[PDB]
Amino acid sequence: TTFRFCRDCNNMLYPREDKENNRLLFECRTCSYVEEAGSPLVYRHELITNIGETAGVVQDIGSDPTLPRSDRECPKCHSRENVFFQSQQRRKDTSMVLFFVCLSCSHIFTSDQKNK
Amino acid sequence: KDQDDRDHFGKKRLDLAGPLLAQLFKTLFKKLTKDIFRYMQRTVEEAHD
Amino acid sequence: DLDLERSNRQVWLVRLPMFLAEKWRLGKIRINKSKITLLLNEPHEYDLELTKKVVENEYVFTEQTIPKKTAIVGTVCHECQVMPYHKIVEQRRNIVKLNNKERITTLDETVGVTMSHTGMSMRSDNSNFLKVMPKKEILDYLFKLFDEYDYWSLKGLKERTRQPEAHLKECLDKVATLVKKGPYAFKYT
Numbered sequence: 585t586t587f588r589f590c591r592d593c594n595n596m597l598y599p600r601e602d603k604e605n606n607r608l609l610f611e612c613r614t615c616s617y618v619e620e621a622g623s624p625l626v627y628r629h630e631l632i633t634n635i636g637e638t639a640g641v642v643q644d645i646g647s648d649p650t651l652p653r654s655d656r657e658c659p660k661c662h663s664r665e666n667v668f669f670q671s672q673q674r675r676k677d678t679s680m681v682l683f684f685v686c687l688s689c690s691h692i693f694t695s696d697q698k699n700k
Numbered sequence: 701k702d703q704d705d706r707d708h709f710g711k712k713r714l715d716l717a718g719p720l721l722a723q724l725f726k727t728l729f730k731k732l733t734k735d736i737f738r739y740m741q742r743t744v745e746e747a748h749d
Numbered sequence: 750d751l752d753l754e755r756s757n758r759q760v761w762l763v764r765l766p767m768f769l770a771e772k773w774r775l776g777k778i779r780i781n782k783s784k785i786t787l788l789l790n791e792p793h794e795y796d797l798e799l800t801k802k803v804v805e806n807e808y809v810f811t812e813q814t815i816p817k818k819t820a821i822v823g824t825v826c827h828e829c830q831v832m833p834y835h836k837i838v839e840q841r842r843n844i845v846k847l848n849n850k851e852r853i854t855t856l857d858e859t860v861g862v863t864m865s866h867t868g869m870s871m872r873s874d875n876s877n878f879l880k881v882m883p884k885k886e887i888l889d890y891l892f893k894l895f896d897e898y899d900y901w902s903l904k905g906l907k908e909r910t911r912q913p914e915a916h917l918k919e920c921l922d923k924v925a926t927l928v929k930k931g932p933y934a935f936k937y938t
């Protein structure tokens with residue numbers, strides 16, 4: 585995660601192990617620029633995800649006519665005008681929880697009960 | 701995103717008599733040039749009247 | 750050989766609509782503070798747009814493995830876009846969708862007359878287009894042809910013959926040897 589690019593080379597910095605100072609540096613297999621490892625974690629794989637559950641929530645989601653309105657009150661705004669929609673993770677196993685969006689604070693909440 | 705949908709009528713088009721003649725007439729027009737050119741060539745090839 | 754002349758002028762790029770573009774193929778910059786305006790020569794008081802203030806790595810240059818006469822004139826200081834005043838502008842900018850080409854002049858004549866020239870009209874060429882002897886004197890010239898240029902082709906000899914074709918070609922065939930192929934061919938050498 586969090587790729588790093590070079591400068592004056594701009595390619596992406598692979599990690600090159602420093603054993604002597606004994607830490608991780610990021611090389612640049614084209615121009616020899618280097619720097620540290622801002623964190624020893626290198627790679628993630630992320631089988632079961634929980635992102636895209638709010639894909640493209642723009643400040644205009646309130647301006648889309650086709651989205652179903654709903655009346656519940658935002659925990660923050662305590663306003664009762666909010667559009668909502670299922671989780672945008674277009675995949676089969678996906679749950680059927682609801683993401684609301686208050687038209688006032690643009691705060692996102694959920695209809696959940698298992699985990700908020 | 702979901703895979704694409706191939707039957708979505710938004711992505712179809714209907715060729716009416718306009719297009720269908722166009723596609724047809726266009727090729728028939730090349731063939732007319734090509735021949736004209738060939739004749740135009742071959743007559744100049746032999747400086748025929 | 751290229752020359753960085755000064756390259757320090759604060760050139761200001763402007764994007765403009767077409768009606769402006771056509772008009773440009775004087776001014777009065779009436780900037781005001783940052784609501785920058787400007788007066789154009791008559792026309793309107795079209796203001797400048799702070800379309801892009803900061804503009805780096807962008808410079809103007811002109812010219813006159815082939816080289817040429819390069820000159821680096823000025824640097825972009827800031828990019829602008831035209832602010833069209835808007836009364837007639839929108840009145841014509843919206844009306845920019847009010848043009849097209851013509852339909853077909855479906856030939857108003859009677860049908861009979863027009864086809865007359867198509868068939869056998871028995872007329873043509875109205876548009877000019879793709880319309881397209883002494884054996885002594887012969888030998889004296891043949892010896893001259895042999896002497897002046899042993900590589901004497903028949904055409905160079907026949908044109909130089911300027912006489913009946915018999916005397917030049919036949920009488921000279923004895924003391925002159927003509928090759929058929931190779932460089933010195935057809936040469937009365």
Ligand SMILES: [Zn+2]
Pocket residue numbers: 590591592593594595612614615616617
């Ligand atoms: Zn680099």
Ligand SMILES: [Zn+2]
Pocket residue numbers: 657658659660661662663686687688689690691
């Ligand atoms: Zn709210």
